[PDB]
Every structure is written in C-alpha cells, then in structure tokens.
Design a protein around this nucleic acid. Structure first.
Ligand SMILES: Nc1ncnc2c1ncn2[C@@H]1O[C@H](COP(=O)(O)OP(=O)(O)O)[C@@H](O)[C@H]1O
Ligand SMILES: Nc1ncnc2c1ncn2[C@@H]1O[C@H](COP(=O)(O)OP(=O)(O)O)[C@@H](O)[C@H]1O
Ligand code: BEF
Ligand code: BEF
Ligand SMILES: [Mg+2]
Ligand SMILES: [Mg+2]
Lengths: 417, 417
RNA sequence: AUGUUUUUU
C-alpha cells in the first residue's frame, strides 16, 4: 500500500477496484478522491498504509509531504507531519520521509505520520549525524562531465561544439546567454539527453518556471529524469515556493554525497517573480528592479558548489537578453559577474538557419585546465587562435564542415596539425 | 419565440407587429423596448419564450446571458441566471445556455431561466462530465492550416508570401510585429478571408479593442465570422470584460474539442488597458509599466495551446512598435520572448508602396518541420539562403516578380532548381 | 514625487 503506486495506476483500474470494494459510484469522482476512498476502505480492515514525499515545513511549525508528480503543489493527499516528530528527528525542509500513514479521523483533513522508516533514502541513524550544507568546503570543478555522445550521431555535433567551447564539470555554475528565438529549447533538450546518456548516475532535475505548458509536457516526455515545472498560469508565489523546494531538496541530496544537476531555464523569470513578490520599499532602481529583489536569486544561483567531502551541485541557468525590457537587461549582467561560464548564442547565426548558433568567440570556461589534459588544452588553444580571426558565421560554418568529416574531435585535432 | 430571431428582424416589421398586437405607440420607442413589449404580450397569452447567450457569472454568485451582437455589453434584455441553477449544473463563465425564459414579474428587471435545454450547443449529459481546460496536455502545432487560396487571384500573393515566410498551424501562438502605417489592416483582412475560405469549419473570432468605429463596422461587414470589438469611446473596464468573456468562451469551446481561432489586433492596447485598471502599488518600472500589469495579458496570450485530446486554440496578436511611447516598447516587447512566431513588417518597404511590406529575413517559425514535408522544408531553406544576402526591398521585389509569373509556389520552387 | 521611466555612447 504505497501512495505513488496508486498514483501511477490508471483511472479505469482504480474505478474497478473501488467498485469491487463496494463504495459510492467512482465514475463521477476524481482520481485523488478515488484513491482516498480506497485507502480509507483498506485501513478500515486493519491493514497499514505507507506513503512518501518531500517535507515542506511551514512557518507555524508543522509541515506536509509534497509529491513530485504535481510539481510540489498543495494537494488534499498531503501527509501531515506534527512538529513533535520534527523536533524529535531534527527534520528540515527537503528531507525525504517514507513511513506508515493513517487516514484522517473525524475532524482531520490530512494523513498523519506514525513511524518514519527511511530518511533521505537512507537509515535515520545516518541522517541524525550529518554536516550541514553551509559548512561544506567549496572547491572548483575537478571531475570532468563529458557531454560527447560518441555514437557518431548527427545530433552529437551540438555536444561536440559545446565540449570544444566550454567543458562542464561537477559543481559548475554557468550561464546560457541567448536572445529569444535562438534555439534554447533544442539546446537544453540536447544537453539533458547527453547528461542522461553519458552520466545516468547523476540526479537530473529540470526546472521550468513561467513557461508554455505544451513545452512542459514536451520536456516531461522527452528527458530521462525528473521534471518540476510551473506554467505562467500560476502566480509568482508558487514559482518562489517551487524554487525553494527544489533548492532545499538539492541541498539535502548533496548533504548525502549525491551529484545533483539542475538545468534552470528561467533565471530571468525567477528574478521577475522575486521582484514581484517582494514588498515595495519606496525605492526603485533603473529598469524597475528593487534593491532587495535580486538577493534571493543571487543566493539560489550561488548555492551551486563542488563539495570536497563528497557530491556536487551543478546549476546551468539560461538568461534572457534583448527582450525589449530594461529590467531583464539589468538582471542578466548583474548576474554576468556571476556564472563561472558563459555560453553566448548569436541571433544573426540563428537567422541563417545554422544550428547550433553558438558564439564560440565569447564562450569559454575559467580554470579549464582542471578538466582537460595538457595536449587537449593546447589543441583547444590552437583551435581558438585559428577561429578568432574569422567571423562568427564563417567560423561556425568552418567548424561544422570540419566536424562533419569525422566522428570524434580527436581526429579533427590530429588533422589540424 | 427566440431572442436572436427578433433581434435580426428590422425595425419596421417589429413596429408593425407591435401595432397589430395592440400596445402603446412603438414608433417613438427603442427596438429593444419594442421586443420587450412584444415578448410580454406574447407571454400574457400563455406561450413560451426561448432565449440564448453566453453566461457571465458575477462576483456575488448570479449571472447574465450576454449577446454577441452587442459585443457582450450590459443590456436590459439580459437573462438572469440564479445561483441555484449554477450550483445545480456546475455552470461557469463562457457556457452557452439556451432554454426557456419568462418576462420579469412585478419587482424584477430581467428575464428568468426556468429550464435549460442545450449547453454549449450539446446535451447537458455530455457537459456535466468534461475535462477542464487547465488539465489538457499541450502540444506543438501538428495540423497544417494552409493559407494559400489557390484560385490564382492577385490578392493571393500575400497568402503565398505568408506561407513561404511563416506557415501557421493549429494551436499556434504568434505575433505580428509592425510599426504604425504599415498595412496591418489589409494584412489582417487578407488573413481572415483566407481562413474563412480555406478552413470554414474553424470558429473564427476577431477581437478589436480600442479601435475606430469605422474600422469596426468595416471588419464586421467584410469577414465571414464573428466580430467582437470595443471602440476607444469605452473605458478600459469594458475592454478587460470583453477580453475575459472572449477567452472564457474560447476555453469552453476548446473543452468541447473545437478549433478556435482568435485574431487579436490590440495586444498593446489590451496591455495598456490592464495597466490602467490595475490599482497603483507605489512602484513604477521603466516606461510607466506596473509590475503586476503584464500578468493578465501574459496569461491571455499563453492561453493559446494545442490539445492532444481534441481541438486547438490559435491566437495571432499584432504588436505595436515605434509608436513614440516607451511603454509600448516595453509592453509590445517583454512579449517578444514569449511567443513562437514573429512576422515583422518594414516601414521602409511600406513607404515605397510595395505591398505586402513583409520583413522576410526576421520572419520564421520554430519547429516548422512538423507542418511541412521534407522537400518543402528543403526548398524553403534554399529560398531563405538565396534571399538572405539580398537587401529587404530587393528581396521583396525579387519575390514579387517571381511569384507573379506563376500561380502556385510549387512551380516557382521547381523553376528555382 | 527621489530611484525606475525619460536615457544614449
Ligand atoms: N539545434 C537546432 N537544430 C535545429 N533547429 C533549432 C536548433 N536549436 C533551435 N532551433 C530552432 O529554433 C527554434 C527556437 O529555439 P529555442 O531553443 O526555443 O530558442 P530559445 O529557447 O532561445 O527561445 C526552434 O523551434 C528550432 O526550430
Ligand atoms: N496589401 C496591401 N496592399 C495595398 N495597400 C496596403 C496593403 N497593406 C497596407 N496597405 C496600405 O497601408 C495603409 C495602412 O495599412 P494598415 O494595415 O492600416 O497598417 P497598420 O495596421 O500597421 O496601421 C492602408 O490604408 C493601405 O492603403
Ligand atoms: F523564446 Be526563447 F525560449 F528565449
Ligand atoms: F496604425 Be496601425 F493600425 F498600427
Ligand atoms: Mg526557450
Ligand atoms: Mg491597424
């Protein structure tokens, strides 16, 4: 008796099971209400019920166990967590809790937690003694997260160009700067697919705030990982809540020496949401940005770091420029002094239908020698010195024509000499 | 005895009928008052009266049935809908209701609804069980909505250029960016005529907010569809109300697997109206735009989506640029990074009296391979690569001179090779 | 109202 197991079951089988259990007509009923009635009827027989979810401690002291399939939205099937157990096990926002639950009695509206069985997918004896995320020693990117497929596919050209322009390692904090209508969607899809193919052990999390739902359901059915999104039909409060829950879960996972990867596509939208939810202080800067509005996105971005004791946190955010709004322009570069990695995309190259439209000149990675060998770094330096004199479109055409001849970049580097 | 039937009748016949029924002199009376008196006299004999309209639920709990011929304006002949029936049939704003009505008794001012016969042009048993619009899975444009006439007319050149620049499919969410005095009116008229000619099965709705009455009555007598407009003589409150009613009706139609097409021509004017009706919060951004003013137009724009279960919602809005106001430059923009189709028009080409004055270079459609075949996409790519080096005016002249030689674009593509 | 917008290189 698990909550996620009943959530994954279809509607027809749940209706059939409820009709066999002998309850009210479930055809004219919601799936969540059907599951609730089935759990009630199964607990009336004396059997136990189990559930799971991410903890969201409220300001009063209690909390609930949000579900991932609903993008951490307030649902009727949330498991109530008393503050006594929180104080007894030192629980915090983001801790994954899995234990026995019971249906609400007369006068209650949510399931109660009796005994916790597993904390953060581990024993509670290992979670009671742990080092906080704020005390971990940061470090630079040491492990190399190669994005090249290696299967010789035609779509691998984007990953090869990305590796030649800006290699990505564990704990990297980069930025994907690109004007609208440049190809950010396809680039993010390719990055997510390459991460899921090359490094399936890492925890991939794609955050899409204030996006077109069709794109949400497309990304959810395309990438092999977790997708937490919030369409534009929701207020900025839900955006802030989702961002906080995601970053808290990422911190709790990193605290257990896990490799978390966050592919953010709405850093600008997140900053707009934070500027909308912040109370007015009577002081407005140039472009309509509050003085204390960028602090929360600043911390959300800076949360990414590489841990020496174990694990890492990678955050790749895509910033929006040339959107016609001065607020986004002020945000983007305020954040430019940030992202230890900038991958610029050119609109002029995208208009020529030359995919990918990557600005190789302005791209780059700091401390790239820690992720590449000596000969590889020398070859990349020679390639950059050869590409720099040529124009952007000409350099992109040259790179595409030279990478189409071979499958691996090593052969291209060997033929360049 | 139908309301719309009496509304379509002329004034002279209604006056004659009222004089034959033996009532007060109807020559010095309004047509609506004449219809009201005729309905009263006909109901005094014991016969039944029927009406219809779009439901507009008020904040208190009751509602009225607005009429389409009055642009959903508050009229004396609105049918009152009690909240009891709303609670009994789960009615919402936008549901088309058609049932028996009765004249108001002593102390009443509006017609009452006794029994509902048809809901959303369908049986109530099919409307009681339905999936909300917020739960439908979005998708990209799959079905091709070809705009080419095919009759070899001289006006078909605009549709041919539009198809070669940006093909339109079901569920598309585009933008027509053009400075003033460019030819937006003729272009919108041609688009509406091509939609009514090629795809007469789709529900066409043209929304004109804050425009001149002459243009309104011109569009109403030119296109073959529904025209809901609101001239500048009305406050922004009526603009917001009309936009809400139109989008709610569109959502209710899409919920019944219908293909709705909305040709918006005032996205900038709608954003200005929303910025005017929003209460001041003491925080003004660059250009005079409120922080929470663009949220409602953002949702109105993002409502457009393609449904996998059935139906679609297409919204083609025309944004205004270079109007001398910085608010529109932020308002029209901020919207640039939202849609997935931009059809730019050049003022320099319009000054040369070269119609249509379309910027073929900056135009385009994302995921265009889902609406065109392989050979068609290759021919469009070759045409774009040939047109790109030439200047805007030169490319437009070349395209016009090459399309004037033949009737179909297939012959042009075959002759280009 | 100052900042924002005006405003840019
Ligand atoms: N690698 C690519 N190959 C082919 N087309 C692409 C590629 N990247 C982008 N595009 C085209 O650009 C359009 C928009 O790209 P997108 O990633 O949505 O840009 P952004 O996210 O910056 O708005 C897509 O619909 C696609 O047709
Ligand atoms: N396809 C066309 N053919 C001929 N003249 C046109 C065409 N499109 C626009 N025009 C001219 O431009 C004028 C204004 O066009 P309009 O569509 O009103 O531009 P906008 O809507 O951008 O203000 C029209 O009065 C018309 O004379
Ligand atoms: F319009 Be893109 F997604 F920035
Ligand atoms: F003056 Be146009 F209608 F934009
Ligand atoms: Mg995008
Ligand atoms: Mg116009």
């Amino acid at each position: 008796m698990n909550l996620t197991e009943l959530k994954n079951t279809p509607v027809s089988e749940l209706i059939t099971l409820g009709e066999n259990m002998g309850l009210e007509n479930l055809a004219r009923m919601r799936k969540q209400d059907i599951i609730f009635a089935i759990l009630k009827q199964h607990a009336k027989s004396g059997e136990d019920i189990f559930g799971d979810g991410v903890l969201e401690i409220l300001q009063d002291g209690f909390g609930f166990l949000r579900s991932a399939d609903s993008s951490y939205l307030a649902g009727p099937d949330d498991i109530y967590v008393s503050p006594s157990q929180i104080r007894r096990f030192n629980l915090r926002t983001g801790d994954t809790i899995s234990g026995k639950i019971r249906p609400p009695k007369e006068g209650e509206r949510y399931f109660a937690l009796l005994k916790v069985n597993e904390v953060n997918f581990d024993k509670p004896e290992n979670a009671r003694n742990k080092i906080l995320f704020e005390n971990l020693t940061p470090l630079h990117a040491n492990s190399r997260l190669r994005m090249e497929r290696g299967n010789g596919s035609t779509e691998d050209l984007t990953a090869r160009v990305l590796d030649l322009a800006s290699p990505i390692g564990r704990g990297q904090r980069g930025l994907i700067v690109a004007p609208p209508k440049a190809g950010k969607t396809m680039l993010l899809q390719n990055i997510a697919q390459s991460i899921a193919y090359n490094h399936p052990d890492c925890v991939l999390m794609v955050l899409l705030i204030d996006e077109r739902p069709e794109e949400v359901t497309e990304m959810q059915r395309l990438v092999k990982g977790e997708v937490v999104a919030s369409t534009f039909d929701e207020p900025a409060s839900r955006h802030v809540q989702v961002a906080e829950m995601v970053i808290e879960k990422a911190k709790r996972l990193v605290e257990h020496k896990k490799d978390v990867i966050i592919l953010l596509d709405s850093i600008t939208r997140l900053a707009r949401a934070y500027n909308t939810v912040v109370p007015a202080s009577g002081k407005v800067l140039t472009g309509g940005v509050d003085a204390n509005a960028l602090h929360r996105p600043k911390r959300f971005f800076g949360a990414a770091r590489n841990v020496e004791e174990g694990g890492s946190l990678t955050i790749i955010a895509t910033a929006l420029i040339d959107t016609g709004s001065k607020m986004d322009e002020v945000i983007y570069e305020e954040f430019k002094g940030t992202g230890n990695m900038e991958l610029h995309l050119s609109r002029k190259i995208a208009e020529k239908r030359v995919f990918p439209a990557i600005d190789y000149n302005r791209s780059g990675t700091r401390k790239e020698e820690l992720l590449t060998t000596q000969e590889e770094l020398q070859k990349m330096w020679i390639l950059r010195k050869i590409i720099h004199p040529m124009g952007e479109i000409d350099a992109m055409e040259f790179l595409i024509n030279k990478l189409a001849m071979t499958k691996t970049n090593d052969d291209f580097f060997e033929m360049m000499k």
